[PDB]
Design a protein around this ligand. Structure first.
Ligand SMILES: *Cc1cc2c(cc1C)nc1c(=O)[nH]c(=O)nc-1n2C[C@H](O)[C@H](O)[C@H](O)COP(=O)(O)OP(=O)(O)OC[C@H]1O[C@@H](n2cnc3c(N)ncnc32)[C@H](O)[C@@H]1O
Ligand SMILES: CCCCCCCCCCCCCCCCCC(=O)OC[C@H](COP(=O)(O)OCCN)OC(=O)CCCCCCCCCCCCCCCCC
Ligand code: HEM
Ligand SMILES: CCCCCCCCCCCO[C@@H]1O[C@H](CO)[C@@H](O[C@H]2O[C@H](CO)[C@@H](O)[C@H](O)[C@H]2O)[C@H](O)[C@H]1O
Ligand SMILES: COc1[nH]c(=O)c(C(=O)[C@@H](C)C[C@H](C)[C@@H](Cl)CCl)c(O)c1OC
Ligand SMILES: O=C([O-])CC(=O)C(=O)O
Ligand code: SF4
Ligand code: F3S
Ligand code: FES
Ligand SMILES: [K+]
Lengths: 240, 139, 611, 102
């Protein structure tokens, strides 16, 4: 009358002086649990171990709070189905190569700061008309944003890039870079050339070697790898 | 009211002096075929580059010229199975890096970025690597 | 025992959703040194999950008039909405949506290059006599996602000092004036006092008071509880909106835009039953009518699925190109959470808690008000906007795509009212050195709680009590049982048991502090429901099935004796709680029926409400 | 020039294409024309390739310059030895033919 599924979860407590990172095993009856991994994490926190800490909010894959490494791959716990194979133990880690605040909560301050550094907002050279009439944009030029604006900033793609592991301090990563591309090709933006000159350095953009782990792990089905390649094509063709 | 440069400096200054651990990555992340093929392209590149430089150093430091060492190997009368092993082992990294290099040049044109195409192009590179390494090593 | 860090700004905003962000950089846009306190990263707020769109009479799809949107919202509110605030919201709607598009919001486009607008529930032309309206501006079906990320990116251009992962505990009150907020830094476990001349509350709703809700786990009504603990009243908390199409199981939202593009509701026999409940509007009636209609179809024996506890939302009759262009988000959600291909099979849906009409009572300027001796008096230094506030532009039933409008319209209104009332850099009010120590004492008590009822168990019994005692259809006997059980749960909060003795990212303690907030909101919601003996909007009483106004507006007003104020119910409920005992005290204030200009926008008298 | 990063990326793809085009040229037209072009293309392509590995993996202002300086010396000797082999010995194309005749 049960189905015991095993979860091995990374644990670390900054409040314990001397606590070393450890894996803890929890047993969950899948008959009394939802289909997604976040449902198991919430069930464990509610009933088994209320000290288990993790980010969550929307539980529907739109906010991007519950990004973590489930079974070797970065994904959203709220949309990652539980492996019903009771023989295998699902291993849950934080996002890879990230400073751990506590348990499964990484520090995304640098990730957020890199997104601010590319100035992700509409910039027109004549902003004396802002708040008057809606800017015109054709359906075809609006279609160019499909696949780019749905990014939820979960950092599943950036934390899966090996170049981001070795050079996360100066390489922006696939998440920020795709958003930089989202504003380069926005037909309403007038700072397209300025946004490319910012990437004229060996690290911000050109640390991408087309490894393509970013696209494989994106829970939104987006392709930050292809957007980076479109940036590289723009960098080599634009004039000043 | 801090800018992104200050937030990045605050991030590193805070975390590098803290007691927070770095979450695992190498020992825990799941591998895939494109991931293994990307590093192999780097490995064969480093191997070919250092094999060219070793050959270049031998030209400046060995007391005999190339036709002499070719005659020395022939006199040893090595078996065909041993000759085929060295030919295949030497042409395999060059064959792989060449096919996967064209695949990288295709990527740089913005073509073949659908994830199902990345798996296709990788498998095509592998069979062309084996085909061109078996034909050349037979000559 | 806790290190205290004192901050001083010209204004402090508690919240980073649509309303919180728009007010945050709107104050910095006015030269105010402003802080923005939020327990989540701004793009994680519940606004990101909004799908349908935002209303505005842009006139992109047909000849429109903002006064028609005004009439729809007033009729939608069932005449519990303050018409001066509805006037302000609907007239500013074209300017607010244009401002968002100028910020870079990637709205869906028409063949003319303008913003695309879809139909939505309860929207009409020619003051309710001209046919179905199309004024819901949308980014496909990811409107709130694109609205929140555009506002967050816009806020990065101003000197707004952000405080992310800070949990606001209580307000710093002195002599009836708000001096700021006290908060807990989740990252490093320190207590922070933010002193400011003005404080804005935009903390969202409290949909998590029930067992099944479309809300996020973080929508716990923390700003509603800070007001209640401060001794100030909350307004109309018993009016809870049940969205018609919440997906079966996880309770995730399936947007009303599905019905706006052509989607219909069918029962177990494939009947479009909304043709029978509302022959004119059909599936595009008001949400309170559609939610009650779906409930009756299930309760009478025409439910769908195996357990007959839901109905079907049919979209497969629509072309697949339109589904992929207009409704891509729900197409993927219906597959992940229901295994449904919207091009072949319908979606299982049922009414689900979605939005809180009630909240912190404000005026049309965003200023929080208290009511003493029949006179609305402004609380000096306190503002509110968004779902946490009760303007009340929504009254007893909010129209779809009006909350996102409320967010940006009244979020900016708080910044505008401060910019005209106060100057930047004025002397910050001095708080006494021990201000907020009762919030720290409550935090430390819960941090070492060691009773018999853990936080997850007390939160569950509350959610199940609200779910079965203050649902769609309500009765007096069932509401009283819920009140007696909710007061017992509140008294059993002294038996709380927590396990995490830490202070850095102690989500066990934070979810317990949210439980204290949820209980205060849940008490006033069900106690305000037990007292309100009428049927208005989403508050439907099966023992008092009539709407009771000061006049019988279904008959000629000539020769009618006006009912006294204490003998009708067209009035707001004002709720108070003594947080020690859990006692709920109820008062009432009149509904503002006047507008901002009678010549420009005529006041709509109460009438019989039909769709 | 402020477009140095994008021009280096473009120059790399240009050499990779040229180096790819010399492999059929070496099989069809072996001789001193292809020998020195191979010596040039192999050195430049390998110098930039090893420079990306250093950029990705070597951190620290001193270790970065130590690795990059030793790479310039490696490439300079590599190009000088290949050009020595093409002028004083049989050449690159002839050597591979003699090697494969074994
Ligand atoms: C749930 C929902 C609502 C919704 C919708 C779809 C869903 C799934 N679609 C809508 C639509 O298409 N059109 C529309 O007009 N409305 C729609 N809604 C309703 C609407 O989105 C919400 O009412 C609105 O988004 C609420 O916005 P608001 O800015 O008022 O609040 P929020 O976005 O929920 O964010 C609240 C912020 O407050 C901070 N917070 C909360 N508590 C604290 C404490 N204690 N300390 C500090 N900060 C706090 C949070 O961080 C959050 O940022
Ligand atoms: C230790 C060093 C590590 C690094 C080694 C890799 C270095 C790669 C860079 C150099 C590549 C140069 C390749 C040049 C090959 C062509 C030269 C040539 O002329 O070879 C002829 C030979 C075929 O000869 P045959 O069958 O008689 O037909 C002649 C038709 N005209 O052609 C062949 O059949 C043999 C071709 C084999 C190529 C192997 C390259 C080296 C491995
Ligand atoms: C003989 C050759 C040598 C010694 C050599 C050497 C190298 C090296 C060392 C790298 C660096 C790999 C990395 O940093 O990941 C590289 C990269 C590359 N090689 Fe070669 N290579 C040879 C032949 C070829 C050929 C024939 C092609 C076609 C080719 C295409 C490429 C491309 C496209 C790259 C770019 C890698 C990236 O984008 O990161 N190579 N090569
Ligand atoms: C000489 C040079 C040789 C280079 C290659 C060496 C061999 C590498 C072997 C590594 C294969 O590692 C394996 O790759 C396959 C295909 O990418 C992965 O499979 C993946 O794709 C398949 C097919 O869509 C799906 O099942 C799912 O997405 C995922 O499992 C698998 O998870 C991984 O475990
Ligand atoms: C082509 O560039 C590259 N390609 C790679 O596959 C690559 C790698 O993926 C490995 C070498 C890195 C290491 C084995 C970890 Cl990430 C596996 Cl769990 C890597 O680090 C790299 O350089 C940045
Ligand atoms: O609540 C609203 O305003 C509209 C909404 O969630 C929907 O799209 O169904
Ligand atoms: S690109 Fe995908 S994985 Fe990366 S942040 Fe955006 S949604 Fe997340
Ligand atoms: S995985 Fe990394 S190397 Fe480039 S293609 Fe994606 S950002
Ligand atoms: S919790 Fe919002 S994405 Fe998983
Ligand atoms: K409200």
């Amino acid at each position: 009358t049960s189905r015991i599924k095993k979860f091995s979860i990374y644990r670390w407590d900054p409040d314990k002086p001397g606590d070393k990172p450890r894996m803890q095993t929890y047993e969950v009856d899948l008959n009394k649990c939802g289909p997604m991994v976040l449902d198991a994490l919430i069930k464990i926190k509610n009933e088994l171990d209320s000290t288990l800490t993790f980010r969550r909010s929307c539980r529907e894959g739109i906010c991007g709070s519950c990004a973590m490494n489930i079974a070797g791959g970065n994904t959203l716990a709220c949309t990652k189905k539980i492996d019903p194979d009771l023989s295998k133990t699902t291993k849950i880690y934080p996002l890879p190569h990230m400073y751990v605040v506590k348990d499964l909560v990484p520090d995304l301050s640098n990730f957020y700061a890199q997104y601010k550094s590319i100035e992700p907002y509409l910039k027109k050279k004549d902003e004396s008309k802002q708040g008057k009439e809606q800017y015109l944009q054709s359906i075809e030029d609006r279609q160019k944003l499909d696949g780019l604006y749905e990014c939820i900033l979960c950092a599943c793609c950036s934390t899966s890039c090996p170049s981001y592991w070795w050079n996360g301090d100066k390489y922006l990563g696939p998440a920020v870079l795709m958003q930089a591309y989202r504003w380069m090709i926005d037909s309403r933006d007038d700072y397209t050339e300025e946004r490319l000159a910012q990437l004229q350095d060996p690290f911000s953009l050109y640390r991408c070697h087309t490894i393509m782990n970013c696209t494989r792990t994106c829970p939104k089905g987006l392709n930050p790898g292809k957007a980076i390649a479109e940036i590289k094509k723009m960098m080599a063709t634009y004039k000043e | 009211a801090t800018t992104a440069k200050e937030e990045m400096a605050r991030f590193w200054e805070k975390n590098t002096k803290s007691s927070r651990p770095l979450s695992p990555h190498i020992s825990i992340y799941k591998w895939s075929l494109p991931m293994a093929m990307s590093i192999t392209h780097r490995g064969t590149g480093v191997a070919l580059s250092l094999g060219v430089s070793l050959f270049s150093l031998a030209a400046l430091l060995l007391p005999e010229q190339f036709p002499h060492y070719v005659a020395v190997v022939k006199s040893l009368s090595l078996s065909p199975a041993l000759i085929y092993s060295a030919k295949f082992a030497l042409v395999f990294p060059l064959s792989y890096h060449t096919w996967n290099g064209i695949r990288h040049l295709v990527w740089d044109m913005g073509k073949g970025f659908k994830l199902s195409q990345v798996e296709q192009s990788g498998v095509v590179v592998l069979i062309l690597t084996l085909l061109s390494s078996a034909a050349i090593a037979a000559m | 025992q806790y290190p205290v860090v004192d901050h001083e700004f010209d204004a402090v905003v508690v919240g980073a959703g649509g309303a919180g962000l728009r007010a945050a950089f709107g104050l910095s846009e006015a030269g105010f040194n402003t802080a923005c306190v939020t327990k989540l990263f701004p793009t994680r707020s519940h606004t990101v999950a909004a799908q349908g769109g935002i209303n505005a009479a842009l006139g992109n799809m047909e000849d429109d008039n903002w006064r028609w949107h005004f009439y729809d919202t007033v009729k939608g509110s069932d005449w519990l909405g303050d018409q001066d605030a509805i006037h302000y919201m609907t007239e500013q709607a074209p300017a607010a949506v244009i401002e968002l598009e100028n910020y870079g919001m990637p709205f869906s486009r028409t063949e003319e290059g303008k913003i695309y607008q879809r139909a939505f529930g309860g929207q009409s032309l020619q003051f309710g006599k001209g046919g179905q309206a199309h004024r819901c501006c949308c980014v496909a079906d990811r409107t709130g996602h694109s609205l929140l990320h555009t506002l967050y990116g816009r806020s990065l251009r101003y000197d707004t000092s952000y405080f992310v992962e800070y949990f606001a505990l209580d307000l710093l009150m002195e002599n009836g004036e708000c001096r700021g907020v006290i908060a807990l830094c989740i990252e490093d476990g320190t207590i922070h006092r933010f002193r400011a001349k003005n404080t804005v509350i935009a903390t969202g709703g409290y949909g998590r008071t029930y067992f099944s809700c479309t809300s996020a786990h973080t929508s716990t009504g923390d700003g509603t509880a800070m007001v209640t603990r401060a001794g100030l009243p909350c307004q109309d908390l018993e009016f809870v909106q049940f969205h018609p199409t919440g997906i079966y199981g996880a309770g995730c939202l399936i947007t009303e835009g599905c019905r706006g593009e052509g989607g219909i509701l069918i029962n177990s026999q494939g009947e479009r039953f909304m043709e029978r409940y509302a022959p004119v509007a059909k599936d595009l009636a008001s949400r309170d009518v559609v939610s009650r209609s779906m409930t009756i179809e299930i309760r009478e024996g025409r439910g769908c699925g195996p357990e007959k506890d839901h109905v079907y939302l049919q979209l497969h009759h629509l072309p697949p190109q339109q589904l992929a262009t207009r409704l891509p988000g729900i197409s993927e959600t219906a597959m992940i959470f229901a295994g449904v291909d919207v091009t072949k099979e319908p979606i299982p849906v049922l009414p689900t808690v979605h939005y809180n009409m009630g909240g912190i009572p404000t005026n049309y300027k965003g200023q929080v008000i208290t009511h003493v001796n029949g006179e609305d008096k402004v609380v000096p230094g306190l503002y509110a906007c968004g779902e946490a506030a009760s303007a009340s532009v929504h009254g007893a039933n909010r129209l779809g795509a009006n909350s996102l409008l409320d967010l940006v319209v009244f979020g900016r209104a708080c910044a505008l009212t401060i910019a005209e009332t106060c100057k930047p850099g004025e002397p910050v009010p001095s708080i006494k050195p021990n201000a907020g120590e009762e919030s720290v004492a409550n935090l430390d008590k819960l941090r070492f709680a060691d009773g018999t009822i853990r936080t997850s168990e007390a939160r569950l019994n509350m959610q199940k009590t609200m779910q079965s005692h203050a649902a769609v259809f309500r009765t007096g006997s069932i509401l009283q049982e819920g009140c007696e059980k909710l007061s017992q749960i509140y008294r059993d909060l002294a038996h709380l048991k927590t396990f995490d003795r830490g202070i850095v990212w102690n989500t066990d303690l934070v979810e317990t502090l949210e439980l204290q907030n949820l209980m205060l909101c849940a008490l006033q919601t069900i106690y305000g429901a037990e007292a309100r003996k009428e049927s208005r909007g989403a508050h439907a009483r099966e023992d008092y099935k009539l709407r009771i106004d000061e006049f019988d507006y279904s008959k000629p007003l000539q020769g009618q004796q006006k009912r006294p104020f204490e003998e009708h119910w067209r009035k707001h409920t004002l709720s108070y709680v003594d947080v020690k005992s859990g006692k709920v005290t109820l008062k009432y204030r009149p509904v503002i029926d006047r507008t901002l200009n009678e010549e420009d926008c005529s006041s709509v008298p109460p009438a019989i409400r039909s769709y | 020039s402020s477009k140095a990063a994008s021009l280096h990326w473009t120059s790399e793809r240009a050499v990779s294409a040229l180096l790819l085009g010399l492999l059929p040229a070496a099989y069809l037209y072996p001789g001193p024309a292809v020998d020195y072009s191979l010596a040039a293309a192999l050195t430049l392509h390998g110098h930039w390739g090893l420079g990306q590995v250093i950029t990705d993996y070597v951190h620290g202002d001193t270790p970065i310059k130590v690795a990059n300086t030793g790479l310039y010396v490696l490439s300079a000797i590599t190009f000088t030895g290949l050009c020595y082999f093409n002028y004083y010995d049989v050449g690159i194309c002839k050597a591979v033919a003699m090697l494969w005749s074994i």
